[PDB]
Amino acid sequence: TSYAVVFDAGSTGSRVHVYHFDQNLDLLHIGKDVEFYNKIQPGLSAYADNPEQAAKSLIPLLEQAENVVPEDFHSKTPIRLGATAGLRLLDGDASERILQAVRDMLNNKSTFNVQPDAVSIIDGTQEGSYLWVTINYVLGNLGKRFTNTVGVIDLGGGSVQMAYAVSKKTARNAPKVEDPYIKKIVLGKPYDLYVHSYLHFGREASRAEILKVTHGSASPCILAGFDGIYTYSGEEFKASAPTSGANFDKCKKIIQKALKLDYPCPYQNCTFGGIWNGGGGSGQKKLFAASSFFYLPQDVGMVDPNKSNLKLRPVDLENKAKIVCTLNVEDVKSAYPLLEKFNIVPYACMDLIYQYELLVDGFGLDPLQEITAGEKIEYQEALVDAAWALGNAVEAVLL
Numbered sequence: 001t002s003y004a005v006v007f008d009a010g011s012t013g014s015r016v017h018v019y020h021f022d023q024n025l026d027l028l029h030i031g032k033d034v035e036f037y038n039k040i041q042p043g044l045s046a047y048a049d050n051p052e053q054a055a056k057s058l059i060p061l062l063e064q065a066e067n068v069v070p071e072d073f074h075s076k077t078p079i080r081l082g083a084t085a086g087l088r089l090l091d092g093d094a095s096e097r098i099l100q101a102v103r104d105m106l107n108n109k110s111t112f113n114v115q116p117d118a119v120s121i122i123d124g125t126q127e128g129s130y131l132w133v134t135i136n137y138v139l140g141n142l143g144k145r146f147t148n149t150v151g152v153i154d155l156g157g158g159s160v161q162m163a164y165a166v167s168k169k170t171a172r173n174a175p176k177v178e179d180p181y182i183k184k185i186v187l188g189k190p191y192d193l194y195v196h197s198y199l200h201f202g203r204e205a206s207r208a209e210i211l212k213v214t215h216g217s218a219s220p221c222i223l224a225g226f227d228g229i230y231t232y233s234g235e236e237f238k239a240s241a242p243t244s245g246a247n248f249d250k251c252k253k254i255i256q257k258a259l260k261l262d263y264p265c266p267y268q269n270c271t272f273g274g275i276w277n278g279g280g281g282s283g284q285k286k287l288f289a290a291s292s293f294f295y296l297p298q299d300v301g302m303v304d305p306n307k308s309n310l311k312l313r314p315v316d317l318e319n320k321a322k323i324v325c326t327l328n329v330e331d332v333k334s335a336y337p338l339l340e341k342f343n344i345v346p347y348a349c350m351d352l353i354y355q356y357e358l359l360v361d362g363f364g365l366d367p368l369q370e371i372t373a374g375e376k377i378e379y380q381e382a383l384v385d386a387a388w389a390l391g392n393a394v395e396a397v398l399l
């Protein structure tokens with residue numbers, strides 16, 4: 001049996017996952033769970049001007065990990081920290097000072113197996129393949145023909161990933177390009193994954209793309225009457241509803257423009273912004289949609305918000321938007337407390353139309369196509385986090 005410890009140092013906070021794999025690479029319970037997990041805030045990126053404190057911040061998590069894993073396993077336990085690409089946007093050599101600060105700490109403070117490559121910037125493409133491993137691991141799909149694996153889409157704050165397995169033909173014919181479109185992984189059985197990560201098309205990031213389309217004027221993607229400013233990655237965007245409030249049809253046309261559906265496509269078929277769509281096919285008919293594809297439905301009463309996933313169809317998002325887009329900020333706040341908690345009430349109509357467009361016009365999903373959206377996925381009686389962590393533990397372990 002191996003344990004594995006994967007830190008996820010994203011933009012808002014740092015999380016640790018710990019799994020215990022049995023001899024046949026199935027998960028063993030750790031206490032009552034199949035996954036151990038704690039988070040802290042803020043994220044590494046808050047310590048740009050104090051990188052030492054970024055490493056020191058992780059101390060507790062490391063210590064939960066050190067404790068959660070019996071001492072007897074430590075020397076042989078892989079500890080990996082994957083930080084989000086957000087870090088590269090820090091001025092100067094901060095990015096690397098922070099990693100280095102993490103490296104030092106783990107070497108000084110960890111009793112785990114800390115290899116020289118434990119601490120890296122992960123990036124969207126790898127977030128995508130790993131997530132695909134997380135989900136097909138859990139579902140019992142590894143070792144199946146690619147045609148019976150489950151596609152994954154992940155909507156994070158800044159970028160959205162699509163990853164799904166393709167045919168030998170498709171892989172050998174994939175265009176050339178800057179992240180490669182194909183990621184060859186063996187799991188045993190060799191898989192060719194289409195992988196693409198779209199920067200600027202994450203949940204938070206999308207709004208900036210969408211808001212830019214109307215520039216300093218009112219956006220019919222903003223609910224009546226919010227009159228304000230949306231800040232993303234330092235940049236400010238006026239978010240004022242028109243006189244008559246949000247409007248589904250006008251917003252959709254803005255979202256479509258913002259997606260660059262008409263960007264010219266040098267390949268067989270594109271999604272948007274010139275990106276090869278990967279050819280589609282059977283590796284893509286079943287989909288698991290993570291993170292914000294779940295959080296939005298959870299937040300607008302599309303599923304019991306105690307639950308952690310739901311089967312839905314894109315059209316359900318459209319129909320919700322049709323409703324939400326006629327409401328004012330007061331109604332929305334009242335109806336959808338979760339949207340108040342995250343500060344996104346004025347974005348309600350936009351986020352729904354956005355997820356509909358991304359999925360249907362963007363990715364070419366049939367709007368009557370049921371998909372699973374979830375932040376966790378069921379493994380036996382328990383839940384695992386629908387995140388890249390398990391997939392990266394799984395690949396670290398197969399080594």
Ligand SMILES: Nc1ncnc2c1ncn2[C@@H]1O[C@H](COP(=O)(O)O)[C@@H](O)[C@H]1O
Nearest residue numbers: 010011012013084156157295299338342
């Ligand atoms: N209901 C929600 N609405 C919006 N964001 C959420 C919700 N639940 C969790 N999140 C965010 O998911 C993010 C993960 O992104 P990262 O920090 O890059 O790993 C966290 O920053 C959370 O704030």
